[PDB]
Every structure is written in structure tokens, then in C-alpha cells.
Amino acid sequence: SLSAAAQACVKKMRDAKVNEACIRTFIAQHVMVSKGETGSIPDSAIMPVDSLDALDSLTIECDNAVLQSTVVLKLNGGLGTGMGLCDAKTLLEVKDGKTFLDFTALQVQYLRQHCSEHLRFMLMDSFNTSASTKSFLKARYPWLYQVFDSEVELMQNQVPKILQDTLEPAAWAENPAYEWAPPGHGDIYTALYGSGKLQELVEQGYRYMFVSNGDNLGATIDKRVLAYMEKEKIDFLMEVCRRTESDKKGGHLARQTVYVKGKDGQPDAEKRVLLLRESAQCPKADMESFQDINKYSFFNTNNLWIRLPVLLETMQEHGGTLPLPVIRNEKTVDSSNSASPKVYQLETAMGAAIAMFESASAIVVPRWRFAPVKTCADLLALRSDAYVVTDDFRLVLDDRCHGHPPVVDLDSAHYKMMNGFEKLVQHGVPSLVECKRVTVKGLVQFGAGNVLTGTVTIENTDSASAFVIPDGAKLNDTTASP
């Protein structure tokens, strides 16, 4: 029943021993793409979400049996090509001598010492992140490394890049590894199911999984969420934050109205269905509305809670897949070579599972559960004193910020790549806890002990010479120039 292109994909995947759940999942996306689907979600088809419960209003914590049944997973399979990264982002330094992986392991240790003695922790890796993550734990945290292969690591799948005009699997004789790509972090459900780990977790008595981004060190277990999901019988819960100006890369919550038409004299009652819209899913000529933080003010944190037996049941009842909406990413098979064949890279976002369950919902959480690092501008804020380290080893906004991170605007010509950002803070990281907005234009180098307050702009109009800010300089509500 499949097309020739789709069959070619199946054959390639089978020959490469790709797990069948992945093949089934991918093919379904392939069929959608062949019928015109791109993943685009226009604003005319959605409407904002105006009312949600709040974590700040919750007080009751879950019982010990529920806490014991909760697995913690951290995403760690992405390639931060936007920050000029070649390995796992979690190996980058966050504070003095501590990486993302350092605080993550310290959070797990803390939870095991004070909350759940046998807390199960997992990492979803790619082959482009697996060995470096394992060797890091090998040296710094041997208790995690000893059970790394047995219970920690979940290996994400690889799917073929398909030619844009025929949807056949793309070939690249120069480097056939470039014929494959990660299918996004929405692959977590497919990888858990196809590897049999989802069934084994349910067999072992686990009932909840808390997933979060590897770059968000503010996301740990909150026992009030588990009690909330138990009481309200919620099978999937997405943590959303009130959107700030800094929330530009990610996705926002949205709703549609599905009319359960009337019965037994009852009228047609509207029921709100929730969905996620990534930035890639917004029509590119309509990005103004995706960026309106007032129109769509609920930003997905990717702190997700899933009831594992219901996820398992749902997948089994759908041929062994979770039919997440496909995102059609347009690239070239060698993303560095504009002359290489153009391809589609079919991906899904794990937050899109909010549309897969009848009892799915979202809850508004404070900013201290969301400290994202998508760019080097985010990393400057996280490295600065605007973020502090909690006792349970979370990275949270300083209380003085009132939930608003400093708005950091770095010249993309000089600081988009990690090597360029490293030159900017070579002599020290400026104080930004009292800085509302910092904009760096042109070639600039921070000095030692810089203190920024208010709205600060550093503009070097002649980038033939870098502008080194003097040591101890204090910039308050000003624009500094050579």
C-alpha cells in the first residue's frame, strides 16, 4: 500500500536493523508528508489558552508509594549546532568547575539522600553524545556509570533523511552517516516503547516519568505535581511558564475547540483540547504572531509528566506507535554544503504528546523551574550572578529578578558560536542580577568585575578593534562606546 519511496525507506531501515517501532512511526509520518503535511499550524486554526491551574496554589504532596514509582529522565541527545557545539551541551560549564551534568548528578544524589533512596534516573542519548556522557560519569560519578548501560542510558533512534521532491532516502557517498538524523526529542516515546524499556518499567512497578531538557537545571521532581495528577487522574501534564521577552526559541501552548455534539437532550458542549506549537510549526511568514508573547503567553518548559502505563496502553492501541504530529525540517543532506541534495528531516516534539491523551492538561509553574539555555546569550545569563545554586542543586533566578531573566542581546556575528562567546567573557562574567537588559553590538570583551545595572548597551562601531571594557567598570542605564 505504500509508495515506492516509502518502501525504499522501510527497506533501508530494516537493512540497518532499525527497530520496528521506529520504522512504523517514521512511515506514518512519511505518509502524512506525501499527502502534503508539513507540520505547519497557522494561527487561524488555534486560539490562546486563558485559564490554567497553578503549581503555586498546590500544597499537598504525594505519598511514598507514588514517589517511589516515579522515574526521572533527562534529554541529552541533541546537537546544539546553533551554539557551535560539536558534543553534548550538558558538558559545558555552568558555574565554576561544574557542568550541566554535574548539577544533574548532584540533584539525583540529593533526591536519593532525602526523598527516594532508589530513585531511578535515566538519560536519553544519541551516538553523538553517548560516549562523552559515559566517560564523564566514569570519572566524576561512578555510581551512575556502573549502571549506565544497565538502567541509565536510553539510546534515541536515527531516521533517514528523505529527498524533498521524491521522498526517497537520501544517499551521501562522501559520508553515509549524514544520511541519518535524530527524529527530535519526541522520539523518547518511540525509543522507550521499541527498546522494551517502557514495558519493563511498568512491569517493575513504575507509574510516572518526569522528563525535562538537559539544559534546564531548574527542573526536578515536585511531589505536589504527583499528588495533583493522582487526584485529578491526569495522564499527561505539561509545565508552562508565563512567557517573557527572552522566550524566543521553543514552543507555546495553544488550544482548539472540539464539539462533543449533544446527546439525550444535552446541547453541544465545547471541550478544550490542548496542543503544542513549536516555532518551526508556525508559518514562517506569520512568525510575528508566534513571537507575540501577549497572544501566546504560556511557554512550554518541556518539564513533562507522563503516566507510564497509560502511555504504554495508548501506544499499543495505536499499532505500537505514538502518532505525534510530524515536523518537516528542511535541510541539506550535508547541512554545511548548500550544494548537497535538499532533504526533509522528519521530527517530533515530546511536548506534542499533550494532544495524545484525553486527560492531558497543563499547569502554570513559576520561573524557578525553567532556566533554559538555547543560545550563548542564555548561557551568559546562567553563568552570571542572575542565577544562583539552590541547596538541592537547582539553578534558579535570583529573587531580585522577580521572575524576569535579564534580556541579553548579543551580536550574532561575534557571539553566536561558543568560541566567540568564550572570548567575550574571557576575563570574567559581568554582574547581571540588577541588569534588566544588556545589548552587545560589535566586537567587545568584558573586563574583570563588571557590574551592569538597568538597561546597558555596549556598541563598538569599528570592529576592526575589539572594545575591552575596563576592569571594575559599572555600567548603569547607559550606552558604552570606545
Is there a binding annotation on residue 270?
no
Pick the catalytic residue from 161, 223, 374, 441: 374
Count of residues touching ligand UPG (by CB under 6 A): 25
User: In the complex, what is the shortest distance from the CB of residue 182 to ligand UPG, in angstroms, rounded to a whole number?
Assistant: 3
Active site residue 374: yes
User: Which residue from 169, 184, 406, 442 is in contact with ligand UPG, where contact means CB under 6 A?
Assistant: 184
Binding mask 59-98 for ligand UPG (x = CB under 6 A): ----------------xxxx--------------------
User: Which residue from 10, 83, 124, 432 is in contact with ligand UPG, where contact means CB under 6 A?
Assistant: 124
Q: Which span (177-185, 224-232, 286-294, 447-455) binds ligand UPG, by CB under 6 A?
A: 177-185
User: In the complex, what is the shortest distance from the CB of residue 39 to ligand UPG, in angstroms, rounded to a whole number?
Assistant: 13
Residues 262-321 that bind ligand UPG (CB under 6 A): 276, 278, 299-302
Cell of 233: 487522574
User: Which residue from 120, 185, 369, 441 is in contact with ligand UPG, where contact means CB under 6 A?
Assistant: 185
Instruction: Report the residue number whose CB is nearest to ligand UPG.
Output: 250
Q: Should residue 218 be labelled a site residue for ligand UPG when binding is judged by CB under 6 A?
A: no
Q: Which is nearer to ligand UPG, 283 or 449 (CB)?
A: 283
Is there a binding annotation on residue 76?
no
Is there a binding annotation on residue 454?
no
Q: Should residue 213 be labelled a site residue for ligand UPG when binding is judged by CB under 6 A?
A: yes
Residues 377-436 that bind ligand UPG (CB under 6 A): none
Q: Which is nearer to ligand UPG, 16 or 269 (CB)?
A: 16
User: In the complex, what is the shortest distance from the CB of residue 64 to ligand UPG, in angstroms, rounded to a whole number?
Assistant: 30
Is there a binding annotation on residue 374?
yes
Write out the catalytic residue numbers: 374
Q: Which residues contact ligand UPG by CB under 6 A?
A: 75-78, 124, 156, 182, 184-185, 213-215, 249-251, 276, 278, 299-302, 349, 351, 372, 374
Annotated binding site for UTP: 89, 156, 184, 215, 374
